[PDB]
């Protein structure tokens, strides 16, 4: 009766996180297709260049009692950072979530920006700033890669630590758009919105992972 209650409370939160995940897809997928249309002057985000410094948007939870959700992700990220720094490539970190902020303040790491305390209610608006710092550094030649580090949600018992490349970006219609003002300006904005979107999706998925992990820890 108490474990059943425990499960009802968790299921209610999980359904909320699952709805957020699902509600976030249309915007990202439509954007990706429009970008495809326009990408087909090459925008910096669409081409590889010599890699001198790399950037990571890291998603950690704000709360404990989630088993090794953060631990396993941090482990995977440190392994990758070292292979870069071993080669003389500097790493900048944009930290999302309290646990991540405390872990890196402790072990060192260049945290150039952060946002914590979103909990069960993350939002795009709270991610604009953190993301902006990294996009600008890329625009300025200060980053040559930008990755998202987070947990992919599978099911209430399976989550996968993941590092994906956001920058640079990873048959055709017979018609073309009338572009107001022009395609260049538009493409630049869509690419920024798309990356922001992917970071948001990474965050909500991590949260879905967190809640699942916590119910398991609550056991």
């Amino acid at each position: 009766k108490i474990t059943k209650a425990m499960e009802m409370v968790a299921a209610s939160k999980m359904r909320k996180s699952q709805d957020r995940m699902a509600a976030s897809r249309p915007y990202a997928e439509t954007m990706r297709k429009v970008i495809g249309h326009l990408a087909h002057y090459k925008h910096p985000y669409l081409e590889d260049r010599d890699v001198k410094r790399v950037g990571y948007l890291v998603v950690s939870t704000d709360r404990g009692l989630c088993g090794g959700l953060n631990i396993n992700l941090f482990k995977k990220l440190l392994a990758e950072m070292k292979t870069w720094t071993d080669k003389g490539v500097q790493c900048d970190l944009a930290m999302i979530g309290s646990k991540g902020v405390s872990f890196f303040n402790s072990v060192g790491g260049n945290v150039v920006a952060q946002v914590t305390g979103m909990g069960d209610n993350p939002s795009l608006s709270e991610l604009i700033g953190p993301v902006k710092v990294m996009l600008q550094a890329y625009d300025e030649g200060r980053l040559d890669k930008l990755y998202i580090v987070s947990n992919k949600f599978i099911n209430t018992m399976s989550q996968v630590p993941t590092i994906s490349q956001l920058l640079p970006l990873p048959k055709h219609k017979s018609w073309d758009y009338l572009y107001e003002p022009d395609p260049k300006a538009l493409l630049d904005t869509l690419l920024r919105r798309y990356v922001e979107s992917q970071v948001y999706q990474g965050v909500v998925e991590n949260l879905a992972s967190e809640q699942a992990a916590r119910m398991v820890a609550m056991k």
Binding site: T85, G108, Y200
Partner: protein, 128 residues
Amino acid sequence: AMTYHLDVVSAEQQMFSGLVEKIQVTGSEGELGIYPGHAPLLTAIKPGMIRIVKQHGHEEFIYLSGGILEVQPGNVTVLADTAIRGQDLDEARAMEAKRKAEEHDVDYAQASAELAKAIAQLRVIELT
């Protein structure tokens, strides 16, 4: 003619989906009245209300913080911002993210040790 499918969505949610006779929205270069058959178009819109004349004449208004309007054969999609976007506003948000991190390289060996320890403690919890 008569109607086309409209989707209004933000990065966070699905705001509207359904057949409409037309929409009215303020574009970056001017007012826009999109009817069925309008040619393909891609433009930013300004913060403000979007007026939607749904199928069967029913009018509906939705306030948008701004975003992108995409018109293609058949479907029209408003990709709305969840907050008013702009260089200064975005930058203001970036400053805060930076200041928060500046309020307070990388010892890989210590990091591993700390994680190994944390893992150990979980194992104890597991074994109760």
